[PDB]
């Protein structure tokens, strides 16, 4: 048989069979109810638009994300996301297919257990597994060691692994991620004059975020440049017209990853929670972690975050120590691709939570010897 490496993600659910390069089904995890009435009779529109079908009908929908910050907050939506994932995007019944889910570190126990209840009871998967979203991005990156920075769309967690042993204590989890950056770019495009309050243009400004934004190498020098020069004023075409010219709001959205004091987050940036995650480890394995710092996640695909990250983490580390960042150009899907390595291993066959192993011990089987 073949195992499906699913991936809940955060705003970009991705799924595909174990044994592929890239996942066969990448679409945003949205569920839209239609707000307006519908005067045309006999149209036969559904009560729930899910997935990429709801990305083409955005101006009529109330788009909702069933995964706010890692956690699933509405299970009746997430069941529709999975049902649309298996039946429409992949067109395979999960009765004869194992399923690899990927859940972030430090989630609630009830989230992982409830996820296992929804997989075994409703979909009747024969054997599913729940794997940690940062370790798979260490499989795909081809490193046995090194702190990995999985800055997802939903949540940003800085897991260290040395010689295949993850360090549980040093794992740092930060709520600030791509969703909150998109909310901050909604906050600072109002500073220019372009209002975005409706969630349907949440997908518009995020697309701005995909194209225009970049992590600047310095901040006060680039704020000294974009306030006087006009070389950074880059325009964008909305889907109706009224092209907008973003100047200093371009490198100011992704800087909130490195200055969480912009949005009132107490913590340090992910250039220092990486350093606090390395200093939390023992003082002899740090040398491989400073060399093997991995970046993954969609939020890490800004142009120039690998140089600003290296500049700040070099400014915090001892200067006699080599700093290297392994960021292959498939940063976004690296959580999936190692999953396609994970379920394809023959030694992983013992790791599946079987249904016979499930019904004997209920939903709390996930935190036992099988993970």
């Amino acid at each position: 048989t073949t195992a499906l490496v699913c991936d809940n993600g955060s705003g970009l659910v991705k799924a595909g069979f174990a044994g592929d390069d890239a996942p066969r089904a990448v679409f945003p995890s949205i569920v839209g109810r239609p707000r307006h009435q519908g005067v045309m009779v006999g149209m036969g529109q559904k009560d729930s638009y899910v997935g990429d079908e709801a990305q083409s009908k955005r101006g009529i929908l109330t788009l909702k994300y069933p995964i706010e910050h890692g956690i699933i907050t509405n299970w009746d939506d997430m069941e529709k996301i999975w049902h649309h994932t298996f039946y429409n995007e992949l067109r395979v019944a999960p009765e004869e297919h194992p399923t690899l889910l990927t859940e972030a570190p430090l989630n609630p126990k009830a989230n992982r257990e409830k996820m296992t209840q929804i997989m075994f009871e409703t979909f009747n998967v024969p054997a599913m597994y729940v794997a940690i979203q940062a370790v798979l991005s260490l499989y795909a990156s081809g490193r046995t060691t090194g702190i990995v920075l999985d800055s997802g769309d939903g949540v940003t967690h800085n897991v260290p692994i040395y010689e295949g042993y993850a360090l549980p204590h040093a794992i740092m989890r930060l709520d600030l991620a791509g969703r909150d950056l998109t909310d901050y770019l909604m906050k600072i495009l109002t500073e220019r004059g372009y209002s975005f309050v409706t969630t349907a243009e949440r997908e518009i400004v995020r697309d701005i975020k995909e194209k225009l934004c970049y992590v600047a190498l310095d901040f006060e020098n680039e704020m000294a440049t974009a306030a006087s020069s006009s070389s950074l004023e880059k325009s964008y075409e909305l889907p109706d017209g009224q092209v907008i010219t973003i100047g200093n709001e371009r490198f100011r959205c992704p800087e909130t990853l490195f200055q969480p004091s912009f949005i009132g987050m107490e913590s340090a940036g992910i250039h220092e929670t990486t350093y606090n995650s390395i200093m939390k480890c023992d003082i002899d394995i740090r040398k491989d972690l400073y060399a093997n710092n991995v970046l993954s996640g969609g939020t890490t695909m800004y142009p120039g975050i690998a140089d600003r990250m290296q500049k700040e983490i070099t400014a915090l580390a001892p200067s006699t120590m080599k700093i290297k960042i392994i960021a292959p150009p498939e940063r976004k899907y690296s959580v999936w691709i190692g999953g396609s390595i994970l379920a394809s291993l023959s030694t992983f066959q013992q790791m599946w939570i079987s249904k016979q192993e499930y019904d004997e011990a209920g939903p709390s089987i996930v935190h036992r010897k099988c993970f």
């Binding site: 006999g42 036969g44 559904k46 079908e53 429409n88």
Partner: protein
């Protein structure tokens, strides 16, 4: 056992019958709640001829309603989804 209607959840019949100046309706159903059929007729894409050809698509399910049918309308509707066409022969019966 390979039952057809793959993208169809219902294909047209092999033939319908209706009276001249009488209305009928074709019933394809599609296994997808967004899959459309082509409605062709004797090999010609049925377009919604005012009210003489009416695609009522209830969710997945596409239904060609032909008003005041005439011996003109007596002919074959091929609901041609790409890969699945049912050449019903409507029998407008004067």
């Amino acid at each position: 056992d390979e039952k057809k209607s793959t993208a169809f959840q219902k294909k047209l019949e092999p033939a319908y019958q209706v009276s001249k100046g009488h209305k009928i309706r074709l019933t394809v159903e599609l296994a997808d709640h967004d899959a459309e059929v082509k409605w062709l007729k004797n090999g010609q894409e049925i377009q919604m001829s005012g009210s003489k050809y009416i695609f009522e698509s209830i969710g997945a399910k596409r239904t060609l309603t032909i008003s005041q049918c005439s011996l003109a309308d007596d002919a074959a509707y091929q609901c041609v989804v790409g890969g699945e066409k049912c050449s019903t022969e409507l029998f407008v019966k004067e």
